[PDB]
Amino acid sequence: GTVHRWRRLPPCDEFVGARRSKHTVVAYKDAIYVFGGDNGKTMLNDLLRFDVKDCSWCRAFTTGTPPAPRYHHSAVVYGSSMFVFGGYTGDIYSNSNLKNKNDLFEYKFATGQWTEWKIEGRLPVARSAHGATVYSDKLWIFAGYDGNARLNDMWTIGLQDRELTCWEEVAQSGEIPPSCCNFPVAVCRDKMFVFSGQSGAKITNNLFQFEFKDKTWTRIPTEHLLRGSPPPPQRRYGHTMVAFDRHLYVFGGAADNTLPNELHCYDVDFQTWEVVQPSSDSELPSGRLFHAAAVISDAMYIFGGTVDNNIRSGEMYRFQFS
Amino acid sequence: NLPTYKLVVVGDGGVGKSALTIQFFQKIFVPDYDPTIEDSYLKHTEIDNQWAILDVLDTAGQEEFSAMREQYMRTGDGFLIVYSVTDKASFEHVDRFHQLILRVKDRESFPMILVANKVDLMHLRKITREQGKEMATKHNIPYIETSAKDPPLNVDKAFHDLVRVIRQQI
Numbered sequence A: 001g002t003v004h005r006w007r008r009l010p011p012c013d014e015f016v017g018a019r020r021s022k023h024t025v026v027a028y029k030d031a032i033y034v035f036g037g038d039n040g041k042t043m044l045n046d047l048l049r050f051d052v053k054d055c056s057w058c059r060a061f062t063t064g065t066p067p068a069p070r071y072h073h074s075a076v077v078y079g080s081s082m083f084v085f086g087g088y089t090g091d092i093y094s095n096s097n098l099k100n101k102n103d104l105f106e107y108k109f110a111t112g113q114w115t116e117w118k119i120e121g122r123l124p125v126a127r128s129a130h131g132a133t134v135y136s137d138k139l140w141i142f143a144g145y146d147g148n149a150r151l152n153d154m155w156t157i158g159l160q161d162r163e164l165t166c167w168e169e170v171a172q173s174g175e176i177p178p179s180c181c182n183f184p185v186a187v188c189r190d191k192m193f194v195f196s197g198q199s200g201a202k203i204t205n206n207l208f209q210f211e212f213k214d215k216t217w218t219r220i221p222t223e224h225l226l227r228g229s230p231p232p233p234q235r236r237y238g239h240t241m242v243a244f245d246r247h248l249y250v251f252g253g254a255a256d257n258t259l260p261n262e263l264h265c266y267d268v269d270f271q272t273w274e275v276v277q278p279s280s281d282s283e284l285p286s287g288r289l290f291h292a293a294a295v296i297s298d299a300m301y302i303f304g305g306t307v308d309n310n311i312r313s314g315e316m317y318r319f320q321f322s
Numbered sequence B: 001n002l003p004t005y006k007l008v009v010v011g012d013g014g015v016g017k018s019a020l021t022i023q024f025f026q027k028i029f030v031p032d033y034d035p036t037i038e039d040s041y042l043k044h045t046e047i048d049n050q051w052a053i054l055d056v057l058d059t060a061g062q063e064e065f066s067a068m069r070e071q072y073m074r075t076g077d078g079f080l081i082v083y084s085v086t087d088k089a090s091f092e093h094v095d096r097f098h099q100l101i102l103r104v105k106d107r108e109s110f111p112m113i114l115v116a117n118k119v120d121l122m123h124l125r126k127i128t129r130e131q132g133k134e135m136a137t138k139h140n141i142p143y144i145e146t147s148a149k150d151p152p153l154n155v156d157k158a159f160h161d162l163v164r165v166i167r168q169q170i
């Protein structure tokens, strides 16, 4: 229970689910739900459940046909359901029938029910490695890779009535981030935050902030080295970022052909970066990318990813935020 | 109805993938391009009196593939395996890149061309022509010596020949 302490929680047993990367992790109640991913040989569409209170793994109860095995998809929790969107579908080993997706599946937590939201009308282009979050009773998906180029569009869909809902493209304003994919997204205060990612020639360590009300982006002027402030984290892709107590925590990812395991923290109010010093009794997680993160109570949870030598991981780590 | 050829430039860090791509597309030698930047280029060029769209991706980084890198590596029509004649390690890794393409493509053979770059650096050359030519005939793929430093050598031919290899299959 030591504060600011990494703790190596029990990994996902081999008979429960395969060690994976490019998966999605969502927090609900006192459990973490892992969906999709890449075990090193094939795509996945199982649903795992890590009970945080007693650290017990199990296959989550699922009825109905789940989404096609995929990775680089997004998952968000709205109300009592989890919403899967997008991703990369096909057969990895034989390199055939590969396509990005723009479908929408709902997983009802109380019943384990998989329902596909067959949305009518104009849909957002099928994409992978997009950003996604839930805000104001709507699913927001942003950027990604569509097959030919990176994206910088943004779409919303109301999650209130499956039959009475459709997609709407957001007329974004402000400094729209450069076309990006493989980046984490966190909502804090009433703003959505995006840090770095894979953006081609425009790959940087800029921090972007999207205020939902006026739908405007702002690249927070950071590295105020005039103030001697600690520098921003190195530019990276495949990293995770979570929000907790007016702070953003960035971990992992591939940064200039390395896998740093430093824990970076961004004070949203004071616009300052810092490296969180883990306690002496901490079990430091190894550098990884394409892992996944969620927050339960005052602790962050890291699952899976790809460590050095292209090795898939089933490890689960917990960092005590406070 | 114009044909599009997705070409991928792969190789060790520093062999000159960015230099070659920028030389081929922008007709300028750019020294010390950002080693981590990985982006794509587009032109409309006429090869053997036949117009074609060229979609080239300058690869970077050895960690897991970004969503863009992966889909390019899986759907690419041809690959340029590039090593530096001044970096013996890059030459020993030609085999590693060769196996990577076939493993991804799940094929016994795929359109590829071995590219020996930085040939202009003669005094510091480490890998000879017979060494590279043997490596190419070992993998049953063509061999081209290139230099992206002004004046460029076989930069246009290297990419064009890869297209020609693609056209003369199946």
Ligand SMILES: Nc1nc2c(ncn2[C@@H]2O[C@H](COP(=O)(O)OP(=O)(O)O)[C@@H](O)[C@H]2O)c(=O)[nH]1
Pocket (backbone or CB within 6 Å): B011, B012, B013, B014, B015, B016, B017, B018, B019, B020, B030, B031, B032, B033, B034, B035, B059, B060, B117, B118, B119, B120, B121, B146, B147, B148, B149
């Ligand atoms: N002399 C010489 N240097 C080259 C050539 N091509 C690349 N370089 C140098 O090789 C280094 C790295 O090449 P770069 O363009 O970054 O390629 P990459 O690292 O393989 O993507 C830089 O210092 C370039 O100036 C070439 O044809 N001749």
Ligand SMILES: [Mg+2]
Pocket (backbone or CB within 6 Å): B017, B018, B033, B034, B035, B036, B037, B058, B059, B060
């Ligand atoms: Mg480069």
